[PDB]
């Protein structure tokens, strides 16, 4: 601190990193995997999830016929992610150790 030791700020601010993550999230939500290979091609999100179900070897009608249940499961899982991360801090130990 006082002995010739200086800490240099990162080139990208936390706001800029948040902007990058938000852009990635928006691209994935609105266009699936197309924006990573080229121009972003819009597609309805249930249709994108049907594409991904096909990707894991499950037919699209399984998603379409269970759309509400699958959406509820996803929403509950994200809410539980929030709950669990806010419940215990040791999950972020890998960062804290740094």
């Amino acid at each position: 601190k006082f002995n010739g030791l200086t800490v240099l700020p990162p080139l990208l601010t936390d706001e800029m990193i948040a902007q990058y993550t938000s852009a990635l999230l928006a691209g994935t939500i609105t266009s699936g995997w197309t924006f990573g290979a080229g121009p972003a091609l819009q597609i309805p999100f249930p249709m994108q999830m049907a594409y991904r179900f096909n990707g894991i070897g499950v037919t699209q009608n399984v998603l379409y016929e269970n759309q509400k249940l699958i959406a509820n499961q996803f929403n509950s899982a994200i809410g539980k992610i929030q709950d669990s991360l806010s419940s215990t801090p040791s999950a972020l130990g890998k960062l804290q150790d740094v």
Binding site: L8, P10, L11, L12, I17, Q19, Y20, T21, S22, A23, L24, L25, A26, G27, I29, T30, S31, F35, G36, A40, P44, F45, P46, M49, Q67, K68, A71, N72, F74, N75, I78
Partner: protein
């Protein structure tokens, strides 16, 4: 009298400092377009809030 030891030290530390920003850029700057979500958050029941 010791020569250029700490010039080496500063060079190494500067390399590390540059590598940190390179790491962040490689992780997060994987798209040149800044995409935005539509104002109407209607995604067929899926909720990303």
């Amino acid at each position: 009298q010791y020569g250029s030891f700490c010039t080496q030290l500063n060079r190494a530390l500067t390399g590390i400092a540059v590598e940190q920003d390179k790491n962040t850029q490689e992780v997060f700057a994987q798209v040149k377009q800044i995409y935005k979500t539509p104002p109407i958050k209607d995604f067929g029941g899926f909720n990303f809030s």
